[PDB]
Design a binder for this molecule. Structure first.
Ligand code: HEM
Ligand code: 5R0
Ligand code: CL
Ligand code: MG
Length: 393
């Protein structure tokens, strides 16, 4: 009754162009079985949304990668938020929500915007730049480590550690094996920066450590909560900003609309997150037998959610394969949905908004002027290099 498919969603060919295979996955049925990895798959919006919003049945504490923590040891100690279920998830989640709060965003917004404007001004002096290394990577690196309270030394480990974490959610393929082989220096750096003395006053990390006396978390939980922000706090936003620049380069009519109304910056970024979904896929594990999309799934089964596919499902979206900066983007699952929905999304959206606002006000044209290079990662979609010429307004 459930269709079996041989598509490998973690193959290099799939990463190179996932969209035809994602249509095949959607159109085969609401629930498929992926014989390559012995997991269930859901690629339509409806089932992805349903799974995300039923955490009791589709749990996260057995891992949100392929590996089942009841069967195998996690490669690093489990995240106290991403890899926890309610109720243990609840109070650490509340702490991170209050650390990355609206009030915090108000404190840091003016500086984040000034740094975005300064970066675009600097790039316009060069003209021909790499929109990944010089913009999508450089701008978050110029604001987020400082906002964390990290020292200057060792920041070159941050993006490698993030890529390692994302690769480690995948199956035991070459991408994952090589990531773990290379992991030791990045992991050593990140774990050390999680200790209270290494996080500057007033930053996100210091605030986590200050939140250890309310009955929500204890002092020995704060290092791993800092680790969560150093796992997820940079590379995903880098990919989203790079995706937005890629979209504006490929769809010049949308850059023209954005220039005419820079208040579209926040939705232009949200639409880039829907369109390119930096986090492509994520797993749950069933805790009991469940009926989903007419299929009966037993206990202890891995369920692979295709977030990027859900964000391009024509059952949910009109013209899903168009980049439309005035689209009603509410409801996309690029940040997840439900109790685990990205706790850092205010930071991501702030960074993306103020960068796209700077581009909207300062740049007249964005022309690709060199070979575009994709980065392959088991979980993340993103570019390695995006040569562009920037024309000033
Ligand atoms: C465009 C950028 C980003 C994207 C696309 C993204 C995507 C996601 C997604 C899909 C989830 C849900 C995981 C799940 O349901 O299992 C998530 C959760 C999370 N994200 Fe983000 N994220 C981004 C930026 C950030 C930032 C800037 C931070 C930190 C400052 C962050 C920290 C986290 C954490 C800690 C969680 C776990 C929340 C929980 O389990 O309750 N992310 N993210
Ligand atoms: C952004 C993603 C969903 C990939 C993420 C979230 C949280 C963590 C953590 O370490 O808590 C790691 C990665
Ligand atoms: Cl680690
Ligand atoms: Mg090798």
């Amino acid at each position: 009754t459930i269709p079996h498919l041989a598509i490998d969603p973690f193959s290099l060919d799939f990463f190179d162009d996932p969209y035809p295979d994602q249509q095949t996955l959607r159109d085969a049925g609401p629930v498929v079985y992926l014989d390559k990895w012995n997991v269930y798959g859901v690629a339509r919006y409806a089932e992805v949304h349903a799974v995300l919003n039923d955490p009791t049945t589709f749990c996260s504490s057995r891992g949100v990668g392929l590996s089942d923590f009841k069967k195998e040891k996690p490669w690093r100690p489990p995240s106290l938020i991403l890899e926890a279920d309610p109720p243990a998830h609840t109070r650490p989640r509340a702490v991170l929500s209050k650390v990355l709060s609206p009030a915090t965003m108000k404190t840091i917004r003016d500086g984040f915007a000034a740094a975005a404007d300064a970066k675009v001004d600097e790039l316009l002096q060069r003209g021909c730049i790499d929109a990944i290394a010089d913009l999508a990577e450089a701008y978050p690196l110029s604001v987020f480590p400082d906002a964390m309270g990290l020292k200057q030394e060792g920041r070159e480990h941050l993006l490698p550690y993030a890529g390692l974490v994302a690769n480690a959610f995948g199956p035991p393929n070459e991408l994952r094996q090589t990531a773990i082989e290379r992991s030791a220096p990045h992991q050593a750096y990140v774990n050390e920066q999680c200790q209270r003395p290494n996080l500057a006053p007033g930053g996100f990390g210091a605030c986590i450590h200050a939140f250890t006396d309310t009955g929500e978390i204890t002092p020995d939980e704060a290092p791993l909560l800092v680790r969560s922000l150093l796992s997820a706090g940079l590379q995903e936003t880098v990919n989203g900003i790079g995706a937005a620049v890629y979209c504006l380069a490929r769809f010049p009519g949308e850059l023209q609309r954005l220039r005419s109304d820079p208040t579209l910056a926040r939705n232009a970024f949200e639409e880039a997150v829907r369109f390119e979904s930096p986090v492509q896929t994520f797993f749950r594990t069933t805790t009991r037998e469940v009926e989903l999309g007419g299929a009966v799934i037993g206990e202890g089964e891995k369920v692979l959610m295709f977030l990027g596919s859900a964000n391009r499902d024509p059952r949910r979206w009109s013209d899903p394969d168009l980049y439309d900066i005035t689209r009603k983007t509410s409801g996309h699952v690029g940040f997840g949905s439900g109790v685990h929905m990205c706790v850092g999304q205010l930071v991501a959206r702030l960074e993306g908004e103020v960068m796209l606002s700077a581009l909207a006000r300062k740049v007249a044209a964005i022309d690709i002027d060199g070979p575009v290079k994709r980065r392959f990662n088991n979980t993340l979609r993103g570019l390695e290099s995006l040569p562009v010429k920037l024309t000033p307004a």
